[PDB]
């Protein structure tokens, strides 16, 4: 079938300067956001954010709304709980983040699940790869670990990730087939600009590609120049495609000694590009 995932990325933030907290959740299939929930919205609901989810009937919207609202309430409580575990002041704002999801292998069969939490930007508690055990970051998280062991939380996560997560994923893939199941290769180009009297900058671009995953590497005589290379973060175009570039300063006159190697799942085979 192919490699694919369904994930939810949730952020709960305490706001003592507003006397409340906020929860936001977003859902993705692969790189494509499809739902959101925002507790600060008027009439907070699970809302569609891709066209191909819009046809879900009201019972889907109602159910997902009940469950995400439930989750918002629990994560708000968790913020208070964690403040207690770390003995933190009431005055400061704190963040609990949660990411969970399922992964299908290259054969379309379930390969991987995950369920993990961070507090104030650092790992707190994570379901291990075996889906049977938990890794706590510190003594606070060990309190939560003990609770979740006693509640057989891992067994409930296994059932969700094997059943509902994968089944939903596969229905989303069908509904969004014309965008989710076809990769678009990068449009590439290599620019050249003298950047001092000593050097010339070669920049290898990839634009217009999806999915986001891509490799751009400069080589000289079959050898990666990744130390000296400037490589920007992959960045979204805003229309479901992505952009990336990689740059290298090379000696004037030596431009043809260097090639940019592009790998992407939309390509028949990898590209070897030169300033041309």
């Amino acid at each position: 079938m192919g490699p694919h995932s369904l994930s939810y990325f949730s952020t709960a933030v305490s706001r003592p300067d507003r006397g409340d907290s906020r929860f936001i959740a977003v859902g993705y299939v692969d790189d494509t956001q499809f739902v959101r929930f925002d507790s600060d919205a008027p009439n907070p609901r699970m809302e569609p954010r891709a066209p191909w989810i819009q046809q879900e009937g009201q019972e889907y919207w109602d159910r997902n709304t009940r469950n995400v609202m439930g989750s918002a309430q629990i994560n708000r409580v968790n913020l208070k709980t964690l403040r207690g575990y770390y003995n933190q002041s009431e005055a400061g704002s704190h963040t609990l983040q949660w990411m969970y999801g399922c992964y299908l292998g290259p054969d379309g069969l379930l390969l991987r699940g995950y369920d993990q939490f961070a507090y104030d930007g650092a790992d707190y508690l994570a379901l291990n790869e075996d889906l049977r055990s938990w890794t706590a970051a510190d003594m606070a998280a060990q309190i939560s670990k003990r609770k979740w062991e006693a509640a057989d939380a891992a067994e409930h996560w296994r059932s969700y990730l094997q059943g509902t997560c994968v089944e939903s994923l596969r229905r989303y893939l069908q509904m969004g087939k014309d965008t989710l199941q076809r990769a678009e290769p990068p449009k590439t180009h290599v620019t050249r600009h003298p950047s001092s009297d000593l050097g010339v900058t070669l920049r290898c671009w990839a634009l217009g590609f999806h999915p986001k995953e891509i490799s751009l590497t400069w080589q000289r005589e079959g050898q990666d120049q990744s130390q000296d290379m400037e490589l920007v973060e992959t960045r979204p175009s805003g229309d479901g495609t992505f952009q990336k570039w990689a740059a290298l300063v090379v000696p004037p006159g030596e431009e043809q000694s260097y090639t940019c190697h592009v790998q992407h799942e939309g390509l028949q085979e990898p590209l070897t590009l030169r300033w041309d």
Partner: peptide, 9 residues
């Protein structure tokens, strides 16, 4: 489909 159980920390 969103999870239908969130656990208390």
């Amino acid at each position: 489909e969103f999870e239908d159980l969130t656990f208390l920390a």
